[PDB]
Symmetry: D4
Subunit: 219 residues, 8 copies
């Protein structure tokens, strides 16, 4: 378990992270953590490692791009003095290119995305024990579907950045791809982005695996 | 214009047709028709052919497959004594196979779909002045996506039944496919089924063209 | 098609234009465009000219007179940097004279109306590619009904102004008059102002015809 | 005062009479009567003739034609054992011909209207102490407007039936026509049917005058 | 009719006057005038004197004493530039003495009431054509009931003031007393203060009689 | 304490007893009892006699007269197999004579009231361990007010029936009358019927005293 | 009765005291006092000592610790100029240690609690006639349950402070303990803190006993 | 994994199982399963065993005891033709003895509980592929608390019935007891019954472990 006792773990990102969490503080309880992967992570950590006393904050905001995370970073991350920061961003940065293809300033293209996300990691890294970078995802099994293909480019940037900055790394697309060998996207997410409880469990498990969670602990 | 003065035109189908129409009666001019292609069709006919004196009934019901249509056909179609019946069904017949793949009783497979729709058309045809068969559709430009591929199969059945019964036919998939050369699905419908105003216009226009509507009447 | 690719088309006026659009920005989607003629115009443009990538903003506000448009012109029009501005105003300017006949300062009489609307066009014209002036209307077939007779005076001023300023021009009263040869006003609008979907289609079609829309495109 | 002590007075009609009255019972003093002319009539009688001890029932139902009145006449009128029955019906009988011109089954034409209303009056008359027949009305000052012209015809039928049956008669059209020499319809009722408080007062006053109400009692 | 053409008549007082009127302007329509005696007055004036074009404003506020009227007089009366001001206040000034008998600073005793109401009349009188002073009331027939007995003291002060300042005068208690010879208070007002439509008609008629209203006009 | 361990105590009456209790069951500890004297009685018994193990059912219904009690007596009382039945009825029996004086069928006059209540008590008495008869009341200190005078008459009937049947008796009027030496009715109940918390306490205390409750248990 | 005529009694504490009272003033009526022990106290005082004319204010706020009371003391207590202050605090100070055991700064430990509560009493005492200190409580009969055991430590501090400062003193835990010899906590409070009406009566009675209330007065 | 491909798994129980599931059908993937352990179980199975193709039905109903289960067993279990039935019942059977101790008919004592649950298991077992019996639980670490002591007794019955019938068994009490070595109940469930997300995870994990779930599949 990478996370130590008494430490503060802060999650930020878009609606997948937000999942209706309490604004502004996103702590004090679960209703406050929302009803998606963040809550599930915290539930499983408390169920299996109750003695850890990990404090968890949810700063997701629906609709955010990486450009939006930067604009609120000081107040919503730095000022919170987290020990661990998990970031999952990029869905909107890409989605806007496909749902509003003629409003191009709402689009965050890959080179701006890369430099901005890099900037967040570099700023934060000296201040925390660790960073976990989760890739964005798109629940679509065809690598050549345009939005899937773009999403994968963004996820490769995330992985680049995690390697270079020694951050932890969760390939959420890889976790979905495995399930997509069986299920058509509709069975997980009608809009290919916002998943069922099952999709949130896919995400939570992928995050827990990267931080060394054990489903049945050995010592 | 295939529809002639004084006639009663009855639309039946699923949510795409329903679009919040008034239940049970579904008529006429002031919101009972719902807020999608059916209301637009009726709007445009009134704007351009006010003297036709057409009455219009919306018997769409959210969720319906062709099995559901059969179960209420006597009360919602035959007992309304329509002159013209337009049918657009198959989206749920297909979609349940993909979004609830293990709930097989909810699925209406091609054999049930062909036999049922054929039977409804054959029985209705001598009771009415004419039938318009609209294909189902899926807003997805990749013919090899599995749900699009199945939807196209269901559409072939509709086309074949219309030819065999000398019904009017609207290929709604072809109408979307034209726009999908420019737009990714997300620009028209986040779930690839329930479209924007623009998608409802694609549908209304495809319906109108088939019934001989003119935007500006030539004579 | 007068409107070119990537251009911004801004609609302003009263409740007929507003039709419940999102405040303040009236863009980002259709819910944002409201549910009347503006939305229908945008739907039809996207259905038939999806490659245009026209951006459309709705600045209608319910209850407005031309005196109200002027008071918000800088923020709601100039600051938006539109390429095309469509104006439809005058219904309230006239209606107040008939529903509050003893509150005369709520009335905008024809000479103030003319100079004010002229002032808006002259200010705007150097800043945009084009202006479309739509007349007000009153859904009433008797030319001698007092409010109809006043409305027609205002519509003649609009046409004057469009001619003199080389603006495009939509005679909405003419479009309604044709339909009123068949339908009594009640069938279109119970208050003779706020129309059914059919009346909104009358308006949208009249606007589309003036900007060179083709229902089936020729090249 | 034609109404005498201890008597039960029952008003029936459409929305103009209903005005949100309590269903099914429609009585008595604290809001069950609704918020239009019926409540005003009852108010004024109580203010000026408190000792009359009149009981009042409101059986108005929004939407009703005379066909609808016939269908519930036994339960809503005869079974209430009223002493006096006031009827105001015909607005919807007529209006449906104009607002839904192609839905002919919703229309109640003059032959059905005369025969039905005649029959209801003839049957009720020997069961009760008296009947008050109020004309329908349309708030429109042009006798040649088509709906006003039809409404006036329906009113003649009411007048002729009242004379033939020695019923009291209130000409509600004449009462509006007097005010319409000063005001355009929009100042009293935006849809020309559902009036302001002032219109309900016009109605209440016309009713009261016919039953021999005095504003200040002479003796 | 004391009130002349085009003049502005402003009503102020407590909940009996307010009766749910629109804040802050209490004009522009009837919903804006609330649903009690003020609205009825305006309805009757418009029904019988539509050509007068009287503008009517309602500044009642629920819970007010005369101490509250003074605190808002400049903004809610003077600044409105009325031609006629009707005041009805004193119910709360007295009620507080009986429902909160141990919170004595919420009480406005008769000498403060008198001087304050006098001060309002004297301030206003040079600025307007006329003032109408309506007494408070208490719907209770026993002169010796403590609250009735106090209310009557306040009403005698009102009458004093009207005489001395040449204001018009409406004894609302006298109008209720007459009806209370027949009806127990419960039949008019369950709390002996807030009346039924009948009680509001009692009030409206008493006001109309004092300003010279004619139920059927003679010239 | 007249009520003994393990017994079921059932309260029936009108709104004073109801006070928003759960329908139909009306039991037990967590809000089903409503928010007036019945809940307070049950609260205090539990606070001071927790070991008594008393079960309590609230069958009060807003609006009821003794006629209404008779109509549901079999299902709401006899079929509950109570040990003790407390009845408080008569307020509406009387009040309808005053608030709806001309709706005579709603009135339950003294002959119907005595005969009915007598009959209910006689029939119930051998089926249960005991009966508590509570008078109705009116919060009005003037014995010569007409509704108070009638209420006192109805209370005499209750007292006489309790004596004749050896029922326990609570004179609720006497309990209010004591407080009314200090307070005007408005301090306890604006409508003279529905009291504050303090009035419900007056009632609860009067009930408790009659059943031998001790505030501090002597032994 | 310790409390004298015309005096102001102010209650402060957490949700047990607040019980939905009106913010900010918590006076003017009962709705304003909320629906728990404070309201019951006031009801019983008014029922039995109506002539006292005691003014009662409720400043409870849900969630408060003693640290929260101090932060609002000047505005919510001192500025109110009470004659008597009742304080009940400590439930949250302790609860946080058990429901958020890893957010230790939300915890108020016993030495901070003691000094803070002492500080409130010492500040206030010169300004008022009297102070009543109510212990916190926990509805749990096992003295060795951890939260019960902590609560008792806090209650012993309260008693210490009351003795040293000559404050009145209510041991709410003692009052509950007696009832807990019969009832399991669930029957009083599902969360062992927020009680039923019965628990609120336990509290109100314990407070009334300490201020010398008599259930039936002797002079 | 004890559950095998294509099978239907049906969960029944009380609120812990219900957790707001869709009534009556309780299936499948998009919210119909509710928001507690059942949805989590289904989520995790899908994340880790998507190919199993398991269908899941939630027939939990808030409030139920085993008596309630018997009454709807035919329609809610047998008629669903499940392959696997999981039962978790006993919490209310027990809790009613403690929260409503004097309402003995609401209690289901050990004899009724054993006989009923035994009978339901014996009857169901030959109709289905397998049964999973989950104990009830109480989140309370003191074995000598009276409700915990009774709950443990009911759990022994469940364990004994599962052994006798060769059912799978989940000891939910043991799963909570492990976490209760660290946390006081209030950190998991304020009422000791309805847990947080973390408690639902404790339950889901205990269920999954018993059916042979692997967090990471070995082969
Ligand atoms: Cl988002
Ligand atoms: Cl659908
Ligand atoms: Cl408007
Ligand atoms: Cl109507
Ligand atoms: Cl008031
Ligand atoms: Cl009642
Ligand atoms: Cl609290
Ligand atoms: Cl439950």
């Amino acid at each position: 378990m990478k996370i130590g006792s008494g430490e503060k773990l802060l999650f930020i990102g878009d609606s997948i992270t937000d999942c209706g969490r309490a604004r502004p503080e996103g702590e004090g309880s679960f209703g406050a953590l929302g009803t998606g992967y963040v809550a599930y992570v915290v539930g499983l950590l408390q169920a299996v490692y109750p003695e850890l006393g990990i404090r968890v904050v949810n700063k997701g905001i629906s609709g955010n791009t990486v450009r939006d995370l930067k604009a609120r970073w000081e107040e919503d991350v730095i000022a919170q003095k987290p020990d661990w920061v998990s970031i999952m961003i990029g869905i909107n940065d890409v989605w806007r290119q496909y749902d509003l293809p003629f409003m191009k300033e709402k689009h965050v293209y890959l080179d701006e995305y890369e430099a901005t996300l890099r900037s967040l990691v570099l700023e934060t890294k000296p201040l925390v024990k660790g960073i976990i970078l989760m890739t964005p995802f798109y629940i679509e099994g065809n690598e050549q579907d345009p939005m899937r293909r773009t999403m994968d480019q963004y996820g490769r940037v995330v992985k680049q950045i995690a390697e270079e900055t020694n951050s932890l790394f969760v390939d959420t697309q890889a976790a979905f791809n495995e399930v997509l060998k069986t299920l058509y996207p509709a069975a997980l997410a009608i809009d290919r982005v916002h998943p069922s409880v099952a999709g949130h469990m896919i995400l939570a498990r992928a995050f827990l695996r990267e931080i060394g969670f054990e489903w049945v602990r050995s010592r």
